[PDB]
Design a protein around this ligand. Sequence first.
Ligand SMILES: CC(C)(C)OC(=O)N1CCC(N)CC1
Ligand SMILES: CC(C)(C)OC(=O)N1CCC(N)CC1
Ligand SMILES: CC1C(=O)CCCC1=O
Ligand SMILES: CC1C(=O)CCCC1=O
Ligand SMILES: [Cl-]
Lengths: 258, 1060
Amino acid sequence: SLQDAEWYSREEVNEKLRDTADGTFLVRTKMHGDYTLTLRKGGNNKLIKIFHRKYGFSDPLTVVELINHYRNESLAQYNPKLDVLLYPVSKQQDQVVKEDNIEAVGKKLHEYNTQFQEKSREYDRLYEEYTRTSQEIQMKRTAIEAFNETIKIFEEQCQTQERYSKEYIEKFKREGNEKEIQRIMHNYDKLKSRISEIIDSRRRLEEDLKKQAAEYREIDKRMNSIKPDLIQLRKTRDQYLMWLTQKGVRQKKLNEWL
Amino acid sequence: SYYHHHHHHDYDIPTTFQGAMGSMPPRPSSGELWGIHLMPPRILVECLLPNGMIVTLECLREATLITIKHELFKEARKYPLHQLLQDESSYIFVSVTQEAEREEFFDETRRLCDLRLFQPFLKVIEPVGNREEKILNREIGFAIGMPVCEFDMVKDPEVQDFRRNILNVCKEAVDLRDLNSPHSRAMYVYPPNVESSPELPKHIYNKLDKGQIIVVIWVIVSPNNDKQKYTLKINHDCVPEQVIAEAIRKKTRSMLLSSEQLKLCVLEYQGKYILKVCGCDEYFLEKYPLSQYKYIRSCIMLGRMPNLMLMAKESLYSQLPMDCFTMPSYSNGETSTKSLWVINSALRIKILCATYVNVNIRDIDKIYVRTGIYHGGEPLCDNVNTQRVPCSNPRWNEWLNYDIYIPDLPRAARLCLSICSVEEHCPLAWGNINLFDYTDTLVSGKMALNLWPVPHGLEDLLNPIGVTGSNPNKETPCLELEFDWFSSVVKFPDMSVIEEHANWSVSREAGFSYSHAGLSNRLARDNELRENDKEQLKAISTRDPLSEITEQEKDFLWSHRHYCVTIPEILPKLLLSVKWNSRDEVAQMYCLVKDWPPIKPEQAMELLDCNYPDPMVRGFAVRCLEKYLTDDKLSQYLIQLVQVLKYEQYLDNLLVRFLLKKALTNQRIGHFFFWHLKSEMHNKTVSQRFGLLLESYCRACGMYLKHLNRQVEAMEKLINLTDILKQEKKDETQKVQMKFLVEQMRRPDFMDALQGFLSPLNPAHQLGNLRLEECRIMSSAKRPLWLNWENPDIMSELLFQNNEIIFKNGDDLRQDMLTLQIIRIMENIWQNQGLDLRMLPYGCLSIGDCVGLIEVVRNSHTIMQIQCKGGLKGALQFNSHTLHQWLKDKNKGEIYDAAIDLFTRSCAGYCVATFILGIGDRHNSNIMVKDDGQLFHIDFGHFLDHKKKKFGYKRERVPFVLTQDFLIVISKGAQECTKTREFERFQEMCYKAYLAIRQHANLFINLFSMMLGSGMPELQSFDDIAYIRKTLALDKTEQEALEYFMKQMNDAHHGGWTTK
Ligand SMILES: CC(C)(C)OC(=O)N1CCC(N)CC1
Ligand SMILES: CC(C)(C)OC(=O)N1CCC(N)CC1
Ligand SMILES: CC1C(=O)CCCC1=O
Ligand SMILES: CC1C(=O)CCCC1=O
Ligand SMILES: [Cl-]
């Protein structure tokens, strides 16, 4: 029972404590101390040493005895800023279809891990489209600015000649009027339809920008519906592998399934 | 009956992928004209004249603006209103560029393709902005890649305050340069390339005559052509001056000069020369032992006789142009505002509305905003809001109630929040805000916060390592919110006020009485502590940063915080043991830090990671670097420092001011300081920050801005080129592609831009002409270019006549960059601690978004090539010995013995580093052997066992498994290699190597800690780094570690490893 207490290295503790609630806990050099209560609070892990010579945290020394009491109680009274042992989460035969086959639990571990690894690709795939799309979008916006900025120069250019050209109609006039003003007007007519093209160019980008900005939303939309599946699939896969590592060691046998 | 006749109906092959021809994804970014990579060879450009006339010139892609202007005014004769035009000389071209700014093209030698025109048109105008010299900010904005005018119209006062304040640093550097000019100007440009230690390793020292080297000094006369050797045999630790004398002695001994007359000729001639390295721009400019310069110590190890050159100081001081730093065109609070400590209420924050939430209503039930206060770790119970108005128009108008009194907020406090989905908990976006601004002012009002997408590795809801500030991407989840307004701007208290509160808080502990419940957090021992305690503190000190401290140990540490000054190196642990949610505590820690002992940089770099966001802390950390960190040690760790800038709260801060000063003091540091900043410019977490900083550097660095602008242009050419090879010219034969590559490179704009410049891998090495016949595309699917330049040094012959480096658009280099850097450090750790293991950390540089440069090591082949070449006609089975046979084919005689020693040394080092860094599985096509018998790894892929993301767990992988091939060579050529003295020695190298790197595990953990800042998916959070904790076995004692390593090495090999 002290061995087989439900809740009873640093690194793989944290991967069990990873993504659990405020109040979740478990117990862990020989010279340093003995056992280590690793309590989770709001995303960070508080480690509390159990010294033995009685077992205890420091002064009130009077393993399973010490942990049960606190399960009812807060750790603020022992040490001030620990206003928080509610979740003793260390079961994983709650679900796993209760499968006592062992070999079939191993087959299932592969099944989920394929479904996971399949899901992690599609998630990675969409993260790239997202980031490429963000780039292609802002490149489109910066083009639009330049398109407008270009047109301003061309609008100014069709205006610039109106000053000089229609000073060079009235002065003289008679001197080649039809032979002169034609080829000033031709220039002016080439100039404005060119503006008419550039505007028709920019418009066409903006319609594409909305179709891009549309697709962009759809990437995020489908990312966020692949995330929760990807978490629970991963979390089920940790537990199916825990179930195995409880009963039979077989650390090297795992590699073919995984 | 294969598949139980089960159809997959959804499965569709007809153009269905990233998998099919599975390589090269880095796209996209644009080049020569809007929407097209490479402008047509002949193109029509509208030329807008000041008379209003659009004349349209057909002209060549490659055509200079002088050529085009000339032809424009010849052609403008044929159009009307010609009399209205000035002389062509009274005009300048202007157009709209791809950055959407109207650049005036002043340098009219530039070509139509190189201008980045957006649309092909030019406008003619007389030169406005009469200070033309000032509008060579285009220089700066080309080097940076975003135009300087883009900063000028930024509203944000911090940014604008940064720009004006940071100039302090630039003036100070420039002043330090032009101090002992022309000497110190040359010292800036050509800093001595020098090992950190003058002391010599015992194995280096024994490759001499009890401390003597043969050198070869070279000199020239007329015109240049003939040069004369002068082969000295000096002491290893004599300075350049001495070496220069002896060269002149030999040069100027004569039968017509007496003994005295020689000595008097020596003195006049002596200090008119300095030593250059033959073959590259490197110089020996200050009193260092010759051994200390890196070229010498390389020459010693490689069995080479140095080739230096006597260089006239005035022929050098010719080639330095003046830097001429100019101050730019861009050249407080209402009093008694507040002590933050007057505010008598809890913290509360109003969460108003998220706008742009993109979610499946069918999939998700409900959505909510999670929040929390942080300091790296969290000052209070993390809280949420209720699951209101789920999915559609998500609107809560709640005040969240954080149990912390507003005075107890520390200076560096930060709100970290995230919109989530619902036990179906799952983050959607996230974003963090600094609870104070840069002017110390508490945040009060309304803030719109555009959020960041949840990254790959993060499953956690909240992400407080993530960058402080709003996402520049507009069309993303914007969650707007409101902070409490206290009828006055609240400012953070002065250090003068905190220094008093602490001095009081201490006196209030001296009167607290006898038994105290939770004594834990204060002394009781007084001046006389226990002997057992004082040794438990030094035990905590020695433990690595990732061995997290317990609440007892924290309280313990804090209670003896004043004894902890005796053990300076404890500080990292002490700081983390402070209750940052208690200003009583914090104020005291401000006084401790204020005059805490300086510590060694390798330990003070821990203090600049994300777990230490305080200003006073990171001040002390920089204060350490100012004292100890040498210009050598800075350029080793430069990456880890530039990355660490991301974790600073504000643009203007002491670390930024330290590095910027150093970058302008040392043109080698500057060169990489530029490229590492420039590299990450694509990343919008740092675009602004790094742009601004790069502006400062570029304004201050002198002539090197012009050199970088060239380097910059070379890269752009190559990016644009490969970009086409990878898109239009995919599905074409090598032959067809290669013909396109040469075609392009023969054009004059390419021949201009790619020939005369400095290698970004090492700006010592120049790059002269392109030899196109040795230029080619490699076989990889990424289409890496194999580029080859003629080294234009006077003494090319003496070093390398050809330089050649690989440019690779396609792959994120910055993981290799790191692992190679890690190896480079491991080597120097082993070797300077006397044990010769030869790693070849080949050069690698990322210069953008999956774009970079890799150094070619000449004469080295993949184990595969060794076995392809050495493999018998009848394709059946390759011989294990063919490696060994090939190696004998190179090394013959006493030479053979030495090449195996090298292969046995390099292999032992590359085994240990590999195991420790957990790099990608080694196999015949990513392992390489050199002719001289040095083995080295290439293409590392992922590092810290990043494919443990899929399954993983306690895999503790051996990535370099020595097959027979390797073992044979190690033990000369015997049957059952496993059992020789040759292989006994090998093992003892591996055991002594593994324990060397294990006693520096702090450094290596820390280096990886500091790299979290970069968006490498390999380094998402400290548990990613924690693999190195397991591999080195830091939980255990060294003897247990040794046996753990043996075990781990034994099992992969299946027999060989257990004696001692
Ligand atoms: C000579 C030596 C390799 C020690 O020089 C450096 O410290 N570096 C740092 C990393 C750079 N990419 C190459 C030069
Ligand atoms: C104006 C700009 C800096 C873009 O031009 C260059 O990149 N170069 C290379 C050729 C020139 N003649 C010297 C400077
Ligand atoms: C607070 C502590 C840390 O520094 C990283 C996050 C988890 C921890 O235990
Ligand atoms: C052989 C050719 C190529 O260059 C890539 C694969 C498909 C092709 O047609
Ligand atoms: Cl290589």
